[PDB]
């Protein structure tokens, strides 16, 4: 976050006291997107920064923190004719720094030039995709053709009553309409008990017609709902879609970092690696912002960063299965005398349970009609019929 007007760090608090610790932090501002600029003081704080202050207590430090120059993590590359390191690792081997406290994934290429101590946490690699929204549900279980056919059935069967009431060897026509309408709707309106066997023998099963039709109704919603389950979800690596892209499914990662190293050293993982070279994003938030805009179907990136995002936006859901278990770590040169004491003092944090407290503070605890109008849709019926009833 940028500084205040006079340069002092802004002040906040947690849910209960415990002031958030902050430290002055220098580095580039506009990320140099072709328009380089000088460094201006800023404020740096959070989970990793909360680790230095604990580390500075038992080791007698006077530390100053400056952000990276370019932005990338680090990767070997050949320049116009040797091999060198860009990103952070260029700065650690060039003597501009002595210790790296940031999310670094330890790997084979990096271990040959710097050591790593012992991990903060453990994680893997997952995929991030958008969600799918379900459907109101009023006229769900029937089709358009059904209503107009069952609806015409009541009147065509009601009239059969009257014909059987004027040839008896005590029902009027108006009451017959009510009795036919009532049984299906399950409502005690008036009295429509008929006489004579023939007129009654229809009334034996006519009520039973209400049973089956209504019975199937509840059957549908039980069937339709629990069995909706749209056929979806990407099941991690080795999915047929990933091995054979159809160019309608674009998936890319962050430039440099580690995933590029992973999908390059494996020879079989060459078809996808060719395709993603044209879509790599040079950030860790633009790609996330891109996925929410449906401009990028999939996204491969680190688990701890991705899982927190899913629990904060309530709009993106992870998937798949973890397939590269590698911890983070703290880096320093092959000759520093802090190798032994730094790595030992991380272990006495897991044993003492300290690293659980930082988890609670910084990661975990940030979890994120038509039928009704149908009752009101019939009000105009009385208004049109208000005068008609008066006339008759």
């Amino acid at each position: 976050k940028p500084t205040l007007s006079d340069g002092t760090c802004k002040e906040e608090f947690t849910v209960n006291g415990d002031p958030v610790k902050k430290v002055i932090c220098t580095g580039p501002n506009d990320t140099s997107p072709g328009s380089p600029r000088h460094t201006v003081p800023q404020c740096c704080y959070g989970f990793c920064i909360d680790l230095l202050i604990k580390l500075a207590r038992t080791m007698n430090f006077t530390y100053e923190v400056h952000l990276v120059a370019d932005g990338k993590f680090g990767t070997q590359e050949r320049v116009n004719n040797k091999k060198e390191w860009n990103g952070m690792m260029g700065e650690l081997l060039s003597g501009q720094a002595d210790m790296i406290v940031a999310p670094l994934t330890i790997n084979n290429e990096r271990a040959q030039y710097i050591e790593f101590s012992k991990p903060f946490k453990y994680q893997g690699l997952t995929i991030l995709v958008k969600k799918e929204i379900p459907r109101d549900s009023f006229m769900q279980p029937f089709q358009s053709t059904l209503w107009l056919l069952v609806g015409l059935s009541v009147h065509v069967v009601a009239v059969m009553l009257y014909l059987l009431d004027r040839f008896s060897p005590a029902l009027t026509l108006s009451s017959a309409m009510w009795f036919s309408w009532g049984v299906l709707l399950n409502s005690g309106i008036g009295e429509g008990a008929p006489r004579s066997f023939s007129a009654r023998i229809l009334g034996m099963v006519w009520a039973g017609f209400a049973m089956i039709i209504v019975a199937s109704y509840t059957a549908n919603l039980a069937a339709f709902l629990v069995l909706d389950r749209p056929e979806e979800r990407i099941t991690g690596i080795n999915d047929p879609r990933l091995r054979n892209p159809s160019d309608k499914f674009i998936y890319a990662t962050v430039k440099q970092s580690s995933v590029d190293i992973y999908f390059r050293r494996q020879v079989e993982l060459s078809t996808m690696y060719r395709h993603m070279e044209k879509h790599n994003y040079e950030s860790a938030a633009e790609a996330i912002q891109a996925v929410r805009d449906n401009k990028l179907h999939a996204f491969i990136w680190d688990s701890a960063v991705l899982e927190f995002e899913a629990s904060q936006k309530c709009d993106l859901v992870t998937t798949g299965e973890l397939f590269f278990r590698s911890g983070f770590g703290i880096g320093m040169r092959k000759d520093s005398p802090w190798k032994q004491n730094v790595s030992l003092s991380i272990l006495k944090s897991h044993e003492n349970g300290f690293m659980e407290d930082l988890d609670k503070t910084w990661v975990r605890y940030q979890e994120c009609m038509l039928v009704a109008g149908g009752i009101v849709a019939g009000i105009f019926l009385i208004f049109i019929e208000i005068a008609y009833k008066r006339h008759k």
Partner: protein, 278 residues
Amino acid sequence: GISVMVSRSNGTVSPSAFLEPFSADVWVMMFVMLLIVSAVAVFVFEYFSPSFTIGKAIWLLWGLVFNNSVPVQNPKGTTSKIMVSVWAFFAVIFLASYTANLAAFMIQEEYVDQVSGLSDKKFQRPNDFSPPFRFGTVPNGSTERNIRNNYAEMHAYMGKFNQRGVDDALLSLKTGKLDAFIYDAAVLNYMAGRDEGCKLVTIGSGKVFASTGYGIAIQKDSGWKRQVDLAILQLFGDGEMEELEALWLTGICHNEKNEVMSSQLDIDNMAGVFYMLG
């Protein structure tokens, strides 16, 4: 071999699905139990304190089993009121289970299917009874040669539906121009398992008719023919052959359990009930 793939035909067609819960045994005997208990009330309510007879004994008693909303004439006297009340407890359960079972029967439905095989009358008779039924295949190939030798009657009619290639035929399926495709099986199964929407299926759940196989053609009486075949047989032994197809010939549209994805019931499904009053 030779297979046939057709559209999903939307939801399955399951006529006479209403009667599936319970069985004919209870229905044929449940009804007579009402008549007995209706007579009992006449004996039960005969004494003490208005002419409730067997004429209306059924009508009141028949009303409850089919839910309610049946205007009736109640009996009288505390002697008989107990019987009709305990009869109601029999009405709730019969209703409660029947609904709680029809849906439980409908979820585990099975897909209807349309035609069985090339021997079906629909294929044999192109338009004799049903409206013009549509099918065709790509010529120049092998499946056409098999059709000509053994089914000479249907090879004349199906000349006016020739496609040109596998892709161009598939689009004509979705648009409804064509609704039956007869092509080599090793291509259809891969194609029908890697399509968006999973709306295409092979009849018979993997049905083939004239089983042959692929192979590597070699010049006649060549010295290599003894060694090539032995090499292929070895690939079965170490399982290399049995995992390559997991790399090129897999899909996502699982053809298991015959997933229906709702039925969206129509007029046709409830045909009998519109007949029962008839």
